[PDB]
A paper describes a structure:
We prepared the ATG16L1(141–265) complexes with GDP-bound RAB33B(30–218) or GTP-bound RAB33BQ92L(30–218). Their crystal structures were determined at 2.4 Å. In both structures, GTP- and GDP-bound RAB33B-ATG16L1 complexes adopt the same conformation. The complex showed a dyad symmetry with a 2:2 configuration. Two molecules of ATG16L1(141–265) formed a homodimer, within which the dimeric helices of ATG16L1 formed a parallel coiled-coil structure (residues 161–194). The C-terminal segments of two helices (residues 195–225) are detached from each other, where one RAB33B molecule binds independently to each helix. Each RAB33B bound one molecule of GTP or GDP and one Mg2+ with well-defined electron density. RAB33B interacted with ATG16L1 mainly through its switch I, switch II and inter switch regions, whereas both the CCD and the C-terminal detached helices of ATG16L1 homodimer were involved in the binding with RAB33B. The core hydrophobic interaction formed by invariant, hydrophobic dyad residues of I66 and F95 in the switch regions of RAB33BA molecule (molecule A of the dimeric complex) with W194 and V191 in the CCD of ATG16L1A molecule, respectively. L205 of ATG16L1 made hydrophobic contacts with F70 and W87, two of invariant, hydrophobic triad residues of RABs (F70, W87 and Y103), which have been proposed to be important for RAB-effector interactions.
Autophagosome formation is a fundamental process in macroautophagy/autophagy, a conserved self-eating mechanism in all eukaryotes, which requires the conjugating ATG (autophagy related) protein complex, ATG12–ATG5-ATG16L1 and lipidated MAP1LC3/LC3 (microtubule associated protein 1 light chain 3). Here, we demonstrated that RAB33B plays a key role in recruiting the ATG16L1 complex to phagophores during starvation-induced autophagy. Crystal structures of RAB33B bound to the coiled-coil domain (CCD) of ATG16L1 revealed the recognition mechanism between RAB33B and ATG16L1. ATG16L1 is a novel RAB-binding protein (RBP) that can induce RAB proteins to adopt active conformation without nucleotide exchange.
Author numbering:
A (entry chain C), C (entry chain D): 140 to 225
B (entry chain A): 30 to 205
D (entry chain B): 30 to 204
The structure:
């Protein structure tokens, strides 16, 4: 309006009191809908950690076995080298 | 009956440790790489001055979560250490002191040779680490420097010549 | 206030403030804070899929190798038996 | 002279495939298990009639996501098929027709032995699958029924006796 009256202000106030509770509806529908998505993330991160931990455990065992194997071959070889001297 | 030389390869993720070691042992560039998990073992039998020698390369992981509780295994009875950085990545060059410090805290002898390798010298238009910087670094730490390319293996310092030179020094117990 | 007057509009002044502590800003806020949560979730999920796919592929290659070795040994056995029938 | 017998172990997750196969090959119960990914291979050399036999067990995955591209590999040149359910879980037992259909669709010959094994028989108070139900299923599919326990390996049908009986049956190519 070029000059606002009480009618103008009133219907404005009703429209805003509509959009406000609409936005409250759209806010309360994200306030926990993502609080759950939080839990899904926690779960998937946990899964990821389990997988990586089991894989890394296998690699640690395999590296350990290889070091023992190398050592065994070193001792065996030096054993032959000691046998030859006699 | 053949002597085994354990040589570990250490550096940031994506500098190309897998590609270098695979290049030396398989004689090809990898069809594809993914982040190394824990460690990969690659071996190559060579003949140096009449003797057969098995070069056993430990291609380590550069990502923190993929090398967790592995370092004790990397450094047990190691015969030589190869530090690697990406010539197109200054950050990977700046990581070198922490890698050195890890080495220092885990090496059990004072006479294990260490060398320094800048990789991806073929990407000349994107290089971030000038030769003279890396050379000064390597000299002050008593390491030879090599600038190489696992992708193009005859560019600058030949990939083969790197590991072969090292293996020669180990076999002779000679200086660098 | 058992009987409200015009000065009780100073309590609506309080509500136009306690509301805009959340009114509109916090919606656009939580919208982007949790459009970032969706991304960490989908990245963790992607990571899980890469991990399992890579594991499964290694197992497939190992099962293929072992089948081929079994086959080699089987051909040895049959060839030996054929030598025996002579 | 050592000939090999590839024997695959098939069944729902958690029925005890890993514990059974390990019990047979290592001669102990697992300290701890996790869901099998892809497959695990366990071997045991035994002697039958003076001949050396390598019993090669494939401990397959029961979870769909962990067996996804493996089934062709399971069934290639398989010498025998062992189906497994959990005696304390009726649903694991109701799964068998689908496992059997998978087998029937992937086998490359009509003369490969199959057997049926109920596991965890030590859990007497919680058993859900009575013997006669299992027995009829087994008979009508031309399979022997075994009820056994990887955890207590001498209860009912001895775990050793199952795989050794099967290996004897394969070696002599007998019914
Ligand atoms: N242009 C070029 N690219 C290379 C070269 N070497 C490796 N790359 C590439 O760099 C990327 C990283 O390679 P990787 O060998 O897997 O790196 P890495 O050091 O093994 O990484 P992590 O296993 O995670 O520690 C890959 O895309 C390679 O293709 C090279 O010499 N030249
Ligand atoms: N009481 C009892 N528990 C058992 C027995 N055998 C296996 N279990 C338990 O059942 C659970 C599953 O065992 P697994 O061997 O890991 O199961 P699986 O069949 O290999 O399952 P997937 O590998 O996922 O396919 C574990 O908790 C075992 O301890 C048994 O003979 N007696
Ligand atoms: Mg790598
Ligand atoms: Mg299992």
């Amino acid at each position: 309006m070029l000059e606002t009256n009480c009618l103008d202000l009133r219907t404005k106030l009703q429209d805003l009191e509509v959009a406000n509770q609409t936005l409250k509806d759209e806010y309360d529908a994200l306030q926990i809908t993502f609080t759950a998505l939080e839990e899904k993330l926690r779960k998937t991160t946990e899964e990821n950690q389990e997988l990586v931990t089991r894989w890394m455990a296998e690699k640690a065992q395999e590296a350990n076995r290889l070091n023992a194997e190398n050592e065994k071959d070193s001792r065996r070889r030096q054993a032959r080298l000691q046998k030859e001297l006699a | 009956r053949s002597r085994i030389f354990k040589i570990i390869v250490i550096g940031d993720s994506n500098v190309g440790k897998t590609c270098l070691t695979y290049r030396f042992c398989a004689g090809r560039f990898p069809d594809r790489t993914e982040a190394t998990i824990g460690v990969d073992f690659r071996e190559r039998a060579v003949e140096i001055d009449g003797e057969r020698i098995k070069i056993q390369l430990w291609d380590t992981a550069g990502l923190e979560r993929f090398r967790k509780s592995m370092v004790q295994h990397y450094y047990r009875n190691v015969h030589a250490v190869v530090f690697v950085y990406d010539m197109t990545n200054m950050a990977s060059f700046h990581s070198l002191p922490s890698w050195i410090e890890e080495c220092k805290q885990h090496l059990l002898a004072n006479d294990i040779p260490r060398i320094l390798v800048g990789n991806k010298c073929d990407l000349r238009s994107a290089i971030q680490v000038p030769t003279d910087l890396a050379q000064k670094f390597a000299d002050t730490h008593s390491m030879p420097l090599f600038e190489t390319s696992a992708k193009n293996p005859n560019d600058n310092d030949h990939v083969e010549a790197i590991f072969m030179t090292l293996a020669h020094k180990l076999k002779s117990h000679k200086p660098l």
